[PDB]
Symmetry: C2
Subunit: 310 residues, 2 copies
């Protein structure tokens, strides 16, 4: 297909947003190289940033902050590790990111990833996921994938890192249909939550194929590629919420909904793009999937789906 710079010129009329997306794709390429040659002798995984040997989750953090600084179009930046925004000396967008989302899977050479969401303005609080101008994730697997969506452009677009160091468009997703595949996150809640239990028993009883790796990036990315599936992460009386709206859930909600899917956040039967983000470290629960499978989620968990039921 065609290149990323060529795609961006038609997706958005904002050249600042185009420079930002270019800087995120270059940082994704460098993180992909750092993970490739990471030394995990020590159960921890190390690589060198400049003159210091830290962990992969920290080399990615510093590489993403570096890319935002030198894009000159970033006002605020915030990482999941330190959930307090920081000024990057630019202006245009505010970017929040999870540097590497795969804590218990880097040593096992599983697919891991980076999540980032882009907000316009000067605030990372008192916003919603619908105010996002762009969102994306870089997936570090056998291939290196840059999966993005821009508000001013239709669909969710996947870019492949080629041998020459450039990005090439390889798939545009605009419809997520029906199928039997599920990723049950937080299954320990099938104990204090009878609605979640009955839902999981539906999946297990209808012969849904199981695909759960523990990392959110590949578990949600597979829905966009297969154009089918359900992801669920549900809280319980004894199990507390661990996903973040700013760094993880809200950006992924845009990638999923722009590809023809739906989300159900904070147990309030609305999209994750409509849940107010009051603090950066705000937690939540979520369901991702096709419209049909999200309807079933709300019917099982709440009684009815306000948006999609009959």
């Amino acid at each position: 297909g065609d290149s990323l710079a060529e795609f961006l010129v038609e997706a958005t009329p904002d050249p600042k947003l185009r420079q930002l997306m270019m800087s995120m794709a270059e940082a994704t390429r460098t993180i992909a190289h750092k993970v490739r040659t990471a030394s995990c002798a020590g159960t921890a995984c190390v690589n060198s940033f400049g003159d210091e040997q830290l962990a992969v989750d920290m080399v990615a953090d510093k590489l993403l902050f570096e890319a935002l600084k030198y894009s000159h179009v970033c006002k605020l930046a915030c990482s999941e590790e330190v959930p307090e925004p920081v000024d990057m000396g630019g202006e245009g967008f505010c970017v929040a990111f999870d540097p590497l989302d795969g804590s218990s899977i880097v040593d096992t050479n599983f697919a891991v990833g980076t999540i980032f969401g882009v907000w316009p303005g000067d605030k990372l609080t008192n916003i919603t996921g619908r105010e996002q101008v762009a969102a994306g994730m870089g997936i570090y697997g056998p291939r290196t994938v840059f999966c993005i969506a821009l508000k001013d452009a239709p669909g969710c677009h996947e870019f492949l890192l080629m041998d020459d160091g450039k990005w090439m468009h390889v798939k545009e997703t605009t419809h997520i249909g029906e199928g039997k595949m599920f990723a049950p996150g937080n299954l320990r809640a099938t104990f204090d939550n009878p609605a979640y239990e009955r839902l999981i028993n539906f999946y297990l009883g209808e012969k849904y194929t199981l695909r759960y790796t523990g990392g959110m990036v590949p578990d949600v990315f597979q829905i966009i590629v297969k154009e089918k599936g359900v992801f669920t992460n549900v809280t319980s009386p004894t199990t507390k919420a661990k996903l973040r709206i700013l760094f993880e859930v809200a950006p992924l909600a845009l990638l999923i909904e722009k590809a023809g899917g739906a989300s159900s956040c904070d147990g309030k039967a609305v999209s994750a793009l409509d849940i107010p983000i009051l603090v950066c470290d705000q937690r939540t629960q979520i369901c991702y999937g096709s419209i049909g499978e999200v309807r079933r989620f709300e019917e099982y968990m709440y009684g009815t789906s306000p948006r999609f039921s009959e």
Copy 2:
């Protein structure tokens, strides 16, 4: 650590076996490059092997046959795609391999892998998995890993593909202990196999963390890395077995039993290294895990563990 060539000079005294492992490690390096730049734009994932242009599982197939031919120490070779052995014009070893395990997850950038087992002599039938002189798997993820074990050497060894194009020893596994992590393969058999259902309900009832990706290479490799876990694939009256002993189950059984684990193959509560391989396309069922978890598998499925109970 130190290199693979240096490891091999100390692991086995047979210089021909060392050349074979080197040829398999070089083929693993080349396949890792082909998967990285695969164009899954069409209905499959394609790359180049010389002039003709094929799919990735076919590019891997021809690369391993080529590596075995030009190693000069291979008598018979056999691929999962055409389960009929072929003569490679050498003499020393017979190699059976699964070129790419996980073609159903390549478009979703999940981790995939190659499996191969190395047998002495001139026949790939009327053998057992214990007669293997070496077995290994190459894991294609964010990193590229060459995981092997040799009959004449203790333990299962991990090799990381370094920046210079060489392999470096990074982890030696010799003990697989106890923990709560499971990979439930063929979960559709929990309907007409009451023992499998009771077993799966035990796993879910003890709050085991779930990690099943669909590809066996990463699902079994995580047991070796975490030194914990269970993998199960159980047949039923309505669900038939799809795993192959020669290309998949027996080599992984050596990798699993080396490093401190155990296996329970077929319906016979014995090791997979002790199951006679009569035809190349022979199918089977398996359980991989720690000695404690394999004991529980045989107790739940058959009543008692002849090797580990009491």
